[PDB]
Structure formats: structure tokens, C-alpha cells
Design a protein around this ligand. Structure first.
Ligand SMILES: CC(C)CCC[C@@H](C)[C@H]1CC[C@H]2[C@@H]3CC=C4C[C@@H](OC(=O)CCC(=O)O)CC[C@]4(C)[C@H]3CC[C@]12C
Ligand SMILES: CC(C)CCC[C@@H](C)[C@H]1CC[C@H]2[C@@H]3CC=C4C[C@@H](OC(=O)CCC(=O)O)CC[C@]4(C)[C@H]3CC[C@]12C
Ligand SMILES: CC(C)CCC[C@@H](C)[C@H]1CC[C@H]2[C@@H]3CC=C4C[C@@H](OC(=O)CCC(=O)O)CC[C@]4(C)[C@H]3CC[C@]12C
Ligand SMILES: CC(C)CCC[C@@H](C)[C@H]1CC[C@H]2[C@@H]3CC=C4C[C@@H](OC(=O)CCC(=O)O)CC[C@]4(C)[C@H]3CC[C@]12C
Ligand SMILES: CCCCCCCCCCO[C@@H]1O[C@H](CO)[C@@H](O[C@H]2O[C@H](CO)[C@@H](O)[C@H](O)[C@H]2O)[C@H](O)[C@H]1O
Ligand SMILES: CCCCCCCCCCO[C@@H]1O[C@H](CO)[C@@H](O[C@H]2O[C@H](CO)[C@@H](O)[C@H](O)[C@H]2O)[C@H](O)[C@H]1O
Ligand SMILES: O=C(c1ccccc1F)N1CCN(Cc2c(-c3ccc(Br)cc3)nc3ccccn23)CC1
Ligand SMILES: [K+]
Ligand SMILES: [K+]
Ligand SMILES: [K+]
Ligand SMILES: [K+]
Lengths: 259, 258
């Protein structure tokens, strides 16, 4: 069997076993706490329904209002600042879902917006990421020549790259634990889930004390952090991961080259 | 100025102007509806508070319970089926957020899981995506030779783009049936899923305890998300990927001449 076919089959077997191992661990960590929390909330729901004389239909009518008011609770999510924050989440594939298009026209424009946006943003981060690596490689070469030597190795680049990722999450967690009044660990977890473009939406910045409309300085920092932070991670994947994606094309070209 | 520096600066100017234009359009389409909906719901909130004799504190007390019960309402999200669905959302960067780790140990394992997972998934989709393109290129060459021969880039972009619409439409038809959504809603869900945006406003396997009671539909939803991402992955491998390595190609050419 060809090297390309062995490599692809190995990756499929790897991903599926990684999913089974992952599902096994998340079950061990989250199954029991979820059952405990569900049982606990089922009691509070019955106690509050009894306290304020609420029927099955009465609670259900009140349930619809509370859920529909959730995106409005944070404040105005769709003026210029909120629409820009949303535009960021779309093209960067973060998609928190804290604010999603409620109109059919909004949903349609979002699809066309993402179709051209996501490739543009992806290419931009890989291009700027490469320029950052080229600058770091030049700075390190000049420093080595300065102290007394001079060639910049791949290992030196992986070290600077990995430290840049740690520092970015630490700087972010320092700021988001301050402004969003979270613990350093929570703010760090938010920064990790944001900059990996997972964006669960369990933690979202600019959703407290009408920040999008009343705190422009914090909003400016938040946009600059998300964009610069994604460039730092983007530069690191351009350095380590990207080379493995062109591997099948390199081996296929080599096959035609020999034959 | 070097080609690399002109290209990078052009892309930065492009992205920022695309963000300003985007923010301008979403404001025009969503600002007024949001103000109208906020005002409508605030009337219903006052009417329901009056109907069931509820105070400011009384409503707030029930508000906390309704919001906290939302992830539990869909059913058990953390057994083997729910943890596998969540494991998919993490490594594929979809991250609906319908179920997120509530424990410190869950949050920590999730971070290490993503750190190694996301690059493994990305490499896998680009590798399988390339193999699919190579097969399509072979099938088209054999067909051209058969009917009465070289496969162009333009022919590949056409088959690739049509495969993308076919995967969104097959998905939309299937999800609009099992989730009782409109074709447009199911299509929008398939688009937001396969682009890894994953807002979470529409999430499959969240009705009638599907994760625990409907294994056949759960099996289809796992297979669709994974195959669908391979179809989009193959298109980026063909069209987008070449432009990401362009800076490195130009930098190598600079050292080659000088
Ligand atoms: C902190 C983060 C950014 C680290 C990312 C780590 C990656 C560089 C790793 C994670 C999974 C790895 C892959 C896991 C499995 C394989 C199959 C493996 O296939 C074989 O050994 C058979 C074919 C052959 O001989 O090449 C080749 C390497 C590869 C693609 C690995 C390449 C390196 C990957 C992408
Ligand atoms: C090298 C790079 C990182 C610099 C990029 C330029 C930044 C300085 C720009 C890009 C986006 C800008 C933000 C885009 C949107 C807004 C919302 C804006 O708020 C309003 O207009 C309030 C009223 C409304 O919400 O309609 C205040 C400025 C701010 C934070 C901007 C501040 C300046 C930012 C961060
Ligand atoms: C349906 C989807 C998957 C389609 C994806 C379309 C992409 C192939 C497009 C979208 C934005 C485009 C980019 C927008 C801007 C530029 C800057 C442009 O820069 C210059 O013209 C100056 C430097 C030079 O001469 O190369 C080079 C092409 C590039 C990277 C474009 C390459 C092709 C991109 C990535
Ligand atoms: C190469 C590709 C096209 C095929 C990959 C193999 C599939 C046939 C596998 C991969 C993941 C599997 C699923 C992983 C998890 C589950 C949950 C499982 O449900 C339970 O175990 C119920 C109890 C619980 O949740 O603890 C039922 C089978 C199912 C849908 C599996 C069905 C078979 C699937 C889709
Ligand atoms: C922020 C992003 C910065 C983008 C610019 C980075 C590249 C500039 O560094 C150049 O690298 C070249 C390498 O050969 C050197 O020759 C050149 O002297 C140096 O100037
Ligand atoms: C599902 C994905 C399956 C991917 C399978 C990839 C098969 C590649 O096809 C090969 O292409 C070569 C081109 O030179 C041919 O020579 C060879 O005969 C053919 O087999
Ligand atoms: O934003 C980043 C990024 C993240 C970290 C650091 C810097 C970055 F730039 N992305 C973009 C989103 N994602 C690419 C991606 C797509 C995919 C892309 C475009 C389209 Br269109 C459709 C689908 N599918 C999958 C499936 C599994 C894993 C990854 N997948 C990771 C890199
Ligand atoms: K994503
Ligand atoms: K989300
Ligand atoms: K996402
Ligand atoms: K998401």
C-alpha cells in the first residue's frame, strides 16, 4: 500500500480512537455531577412552583419568556459594536452564539458573509502568522550574532512559538478575570476556547454591565486581543501543523516524479 | 516593497474593511427587529408577572431555575452518546455549547484534549480530503477517456462546489425531517455546523431524548458531521490551502534568487 493511503488510514483510526477515549473520560468526569445537578434543580423547580402557586402550563408560559429574554439580558447585541463583535465570531469560526441572526435575511446574509469571510480570515492569519515567524527568526538571528556566534533552528522556533501561546492566554486571563470578574482559571479557559475557535459560548466577553455600549476602551481591547491572539496561535500552526496537511500532495508528486 | 509584505498588508486591509461592511449590514438587518422583540417580550413579562401575582424577586428566583434547567431539558448530555457528540464538537472546533464542561476536571481535560485533538482532526480532514480529490480526479479522467482527457483545476472547483451544496441539501432534507425544522432552518444549521461556526441556536439530537432513545439517528448525525466536514475539508484543500503556504513559497524564492 502507498505511503499516502497508509498515512490517511492511520489518521482515521487515530481520530476515531481519540473520540472513543475522549467520550470515555468526559463520561467519568461529567456524568455523575450532571445527574446530581439535574436532581437538585428538579426539586428547586417544584419548590418554586408551589411557593408562587404555578401550574404545569403557568410555569411553561413563564419558561418561554425567560429563555427568549436571555440574549436581551446582556444588553443591545446588534448596534455597531455588537454587530462588529458578531462579525468577528462568524469569519473567525468562533461562533459563541451569544447573539445569532433572528431574521431570515440576517441568517441568509450571514451564510454568504461566512462563505467569502472564513477563507479571507484563514488566509490572513496564516499570512500574518508567517510574517511574525519571519520577524522572530530574524530577531533571534540578530540576537545570536549580537551575543557571540547563528542559524535559527526549528526547535528554537517551536520554543518561542509555544511560550508566545502561554503568554497570550496568561495576559488575556489577567484582563478577562479583572473585567468579567471570573477566576484566572475561568478567564484562561475562555481564552483557550476562544483562540482555538471552539467558542462554546459558556463564557463570553462584553456581556456584563452593557459593556458593548458603555465601555468602548474594554471593547477595543477585546477585539484587538481576539485578533492578535488568533494571529499568535495561527503563527504556531503555520510553523508546526500546516506542513502535515501538504504531506499527501508531496508524496503524490513524488510518485509521478519517479514513474 | 516585497510581494509577501504587499499580500499580507492587502489581506489585513481586506479583513478589517470586511468586518466594518459586515457590522454595517448586520446593524441594518438586526438592530430594529431586536428593539421590537425586546419591547414585545417586556410586555409579556409584565403581563405574566401580573397574571400569576409575581414580584421582582419572585420572577428573578424562577428566572435562575429556568436558565439552569435548559441543558438538562434536552436530556442526559454526558453519558457515552452525549460525551461522544461533545468530543466531536471539541476536536472539530464546532463547539455548539449545548453541553459544556461544568467541572474543573472536565474543563482541564477539555483543554488538553483540544490541544492535541484539533491538529489531529485538521490533518485527518486535509489528508482524507486530498484522497477524495485524487479519486474524483481519477474518476473524471476515466469518464472523459470513456465518453470520447486531462482534468483541469476549473473542473475540480465545479465538482467540489457542487459536492458542498449536495452535502448541505442532503443534510437539510434529513434534519428538517427528524428535528421538525423547516428546510431553510435545517440548511442554516448544516451550513453553521460544516463551517465550524457552531452558534448552537440549532443543535441536532436535542429533542425527545434522541441521544439515549434514538441510536440510529445518533449514528447518522455523527456520520453526517464527519463526512460533511471531509467534503468541505477537500474543497479548502483544493482552493484555499494553496494561498496559506504562498508567503513561505515567496520567502524561499527570495533566498533562491539572492
Ligand atoms: C501543541 C499542538 C499544536 C501540537 C500538534 C501535534 C501535531 C504535530 C501531531 C498531532 C497528531 C499527529 C499525527 C498523528 C498520526 C500521523 C500518522 C503517521 O502515519 C504513519 O506513520 C504512516 C505513514 C508514514 O510512514 O508516513 C504520520 C504522522 C501523523 C500524520 C502525525 C503528524 C503530527 C501530528 C499532526
Ligand atoms: C493593529 C490592529 C490590531 C489595529 C486595528 C484597528 C483598531 C484600533 C480598531 C479595529 C476595530 C475597532 C473597533 C470597532 C468598533 C468599535 C465600537 C465603537 O462603539 C460604538 O460605535 C458605540 C455605538 C454603537 O454601538 O453603535 C467604539 C469603537 C470600537 C471599539 C473600535 C475601536 C478601534 C478598533 C479596535
Ligand atoms: C467558497 C470559498 C471556499 C471560496 C474561497 C475564496 C478564496 C480563494 C479567496 C477569498 C479571499 C481571497 C484573497 C483576497 C486578497 C488577496 C490579496 C492579494 O494580494 C495582492 O494582489 C498583492 C500581492 C500579489 O501581487 O500577490 C493576493 C490574493 C489574495 C490573498 C486572495 C486569494 C484568494 C482568496 C483567499
Ligand atoms: C468510516 C465511517 C464512515 C464509519 C465510522 C464508524 C461508525 C459506524 C461509528 C463511529 C461512531 C459510532 C457511534 C458512537 C456512539 C454511539 C452511541 C451509542 O449509544 C449508547 O451507547 C447508549 C448509552 C449511552 O449513551 O451510554 C449507540 C451507537 C453510537 C450511535 C455509535 C454508532 C456507530 C458509529 C456512528
Ligand atoms: C508584524 C509583522 C512584521 C512583518 C515583517 C517581517 C519581515 C521583516 O524582516 C526581514 O526579514 C528578512 C529575512 O531574510 C531580512 O533580510 C530583512 O532584513 C528583515 O527586515
Ligand atoms: C474515500 C477516499 C478513497 C481514496 C482512494 C484514493 C485512490 C487514488 O487513486 C489512484 O490514483 C492514481 C493516480 O495516478 C492511479 O494511478 C491509481 O490507479 C489510483 O488507484
Ligand atoms: O480559525 C481557525 C484558527 C484556529 C486556531 C488558530 C488560528 C486559526 F486561524 N481555523 C479555521 C477553522 N478550523 C478549520 C476547520 C474547518 C473549516 C474551515 C473553513 C471552512 Br469554509 C469550513 C470548515 N473544518 C474543520 C474540521 C476539523 C478541524 C478544523 N476545521 C481551524 C482553523
Ligand atoms: K471553528
Ligand atoms: K457556540
Ligand atoms: K466554533
Ligand atoms: K461555536
Amino acid at each position: 500500500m502507498k505511503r499516502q493511503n497508509v498515512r490517511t488510514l492511520a489518521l482515521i483510526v487515530c481520530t476515531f480512537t481519540y473520540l472513543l477515549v475522549g467520550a470515555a473520560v468526559f463520561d467519568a468526569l461529567e456524568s455523575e455531577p450532571e445527574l446530581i445537578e439535574r436532581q437538585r434543580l428538579e426539586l428547586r423547580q417544584q419548590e418554586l412552583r408551589a411557593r408562587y402557586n404555578l401550574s404545569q402550563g403557568g410555569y411553561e408560559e413563564l419558561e418561554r419568556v425567560v429563555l427568549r429574554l436571555k440574549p436581551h439580558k446582556a444588553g443591545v447585541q446588534w448596534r455597531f459594536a455588537g454587530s462588529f463583535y458578531f462579525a468577528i465570531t462568524v469569519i473567525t469560526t468562533i461562533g459563541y452564539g451569544h447573539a445569532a441572526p433572528s431574521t431570515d435575511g440576517g441568517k441568509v446574509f450571514c451564510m454568504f458573509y461566512a462563505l467569502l469571510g472564513i477563507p479571507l480570515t484563514l488566509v490572513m492569519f496564516q499570512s500574518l502568522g508567517e510574517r511574525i515567524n519571519t520577524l522572530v527568526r530574524y530577531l533571534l538571528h540578530r540576537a545570536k550574532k549580537g551575543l557571540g556566534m547563528a542559524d535559527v533552528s526549528m526547535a528554537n522556533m517551536v520554543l518561542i512559538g509555544f511560550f508566545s501561546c502561554i503568554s497570550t492566554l496568561c495576559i488575556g486571563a489577567a484582563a478577562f478575570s479583572h473585567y468579567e470578574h471570573w477566576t484566572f482559571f475561568q478567564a484562561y479557559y475562555y481564552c483557550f476556547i476562544t483562540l482555538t475557535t471552539i467558542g462554546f459560548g459558556d463564557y463570553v466577553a462584553l456581556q456584563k454591565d452593557q459593556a458593548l455600549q458603555t465601555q468602548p476602551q474594554y471593547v477595543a481591547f477585546s477585539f484587538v486581543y481576539i485578533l492578535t491572539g488568533l494571529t499568535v496561535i495561527g503563527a504556531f500552526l503555520n510553523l508546526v501543523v500546516l506542513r502535515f496537511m501538504t504531506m499527501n500532495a508531496e508524496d503524490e508528486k513524488r510518485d509521478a516524479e519517479n514513474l
